[PDB]
């Protein structure tokens, strides 16, 4: 384990982002059980969404791995929970930390795309039938995020 990883865990626990619980697994210090409350005023309000974070072999050279455990209707999230986000592939610098990724995901939930639209079936639905999309997300928050 790098000093980077042990210090990041301690700072992440020392100063929590409001609306995000993130406990490392005692068995695998590279794995993090992340829970996010659906931002107030969003289509996800009242829902609680499970995510998982993994710090790969290469960390902090390679970006962290993040995925939704909870089913969610969102442009940046796919049918298996894989998050399309710049700072998780192309635009990740070794200088960036976990809590950046973490609340970056939270910002996504707060106000779903597009500032530059990504091309998928969900995002296309938001780009035209937005009011319909928001009601879909509200419904999916009910049956997946609310127990």
């Amino acid at each position: 384990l790098p000093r980077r990883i042990i210090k990041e865990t301690q700072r992440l626990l020392a100063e929590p982002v409001p609306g995000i619980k993130a406990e490392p697994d005692e068995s695998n210090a590279r794995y993090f059980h992340v829970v996010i409350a659906g931002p107030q005023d969003s289509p996800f309000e009242g829902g609680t969404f499970k995510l998982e974070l993994f710090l790969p072999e290469e960390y902090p050279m390679a970006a962290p791995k993040v995925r939704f455990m909870t089913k969610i209707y969102h442009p940046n999230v796919d049918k298996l929970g894989r998050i399309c986000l710049d700072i998780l592939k192309d635009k990740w610098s070794p200088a960036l930390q976990i809590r950046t990724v973490l609340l970056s995901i939270q910002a996504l939930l707060s106000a779903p795309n597009p500032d530059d639209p990504l091309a998928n079936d969900v995002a296309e639905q938001w780009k035209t039938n937005e009011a319909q999309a928001i009601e879909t997300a509200r419904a999916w928050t009910r049956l997946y995020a609310m127990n």
Partner: protein, 210 residues
């Protein structure tokens, strides 16, 4: 293919034409680096540390800036326990030049992925740190309506991201080390100052000249 290569001859560029003839009458030796988009930071990083094995004056002057560099970025808003490990790698290379080491012993440490990349990161951080300090100045040198901070989050800080004049001007003025770039298509960065580091730019590559 190595990360940083041997001190190869300048006649090897005819294997890849009258523009090299002009380059020969002012240069004699080339040093190749892996064309992985991290060229500039690895090339300058070796060019300047290799030149410091002859120059004790610039060595201790360089060490003073580099040490003070860490606290500079922290005063600028970089979380300290982030850059600590890349600074520790950077200072450990300055300490390895201070202790008189061979050019071949230095090269073997630059071809170590971990040690080399960790340095490239800190050189990128140094570039990105200085661009954000002189944010007001560089604002209109960026295209696409990208802000200086955004340009830094997208083209400067992340690995495997190509360098142009904005990166070169930036790192040069941060460490106060002049650079001259020769374009396989001459420019001094910054303007007027005597060049310490000679480089050759081909589309996608940066090379150390001598």
């Amino acid at each position: 293919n190595p990360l940083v290569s041997e001190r190869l001859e300048l006649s090897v560029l005819y294997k890849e034409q009258q523009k090299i003839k002009d380059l020969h009458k002012k240069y004699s030796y080339i040093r190749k680096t892996r064309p992985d988009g991290n060229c500039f930071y690895r090339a300058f990083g070796f060019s300047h540390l290799e030149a410091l094995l002859d120059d004790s004056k610039e060595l201790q002057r360089f060490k003073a800036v580099s040490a003070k560099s860490k606290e500079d970025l922290v005063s600028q808003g970089f979380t300290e326990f982030t850059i600590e490990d890349f600074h520790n790698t950077f200072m450990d290379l300055i300490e390895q030049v201070e202790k008189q080491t061979s050019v071949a012993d230095l090269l073997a440490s630059f071809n170590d992925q971990s040690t080399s990349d960790y340095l490239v990161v800190y050189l990128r951080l140094l570039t990105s740190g200085y661009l954000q300090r002189e944010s007001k100045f560089f604002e209109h040198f960026i295209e696409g309506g990208r802000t200086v901070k955004e340009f830094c989050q997208q083209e400067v800080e992340p690995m495997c991201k190509e360098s142009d004049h904005i990166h070169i001007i930036a790192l040069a003025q941060a460490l106060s080390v002049s650079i001259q770039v020769e374009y396989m298509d001459p420019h001094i960065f910054p303007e007027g100052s005597e060049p310490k580091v000679y480089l050759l730019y081909r589309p996608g590559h940066y090379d150390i000249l001598y």
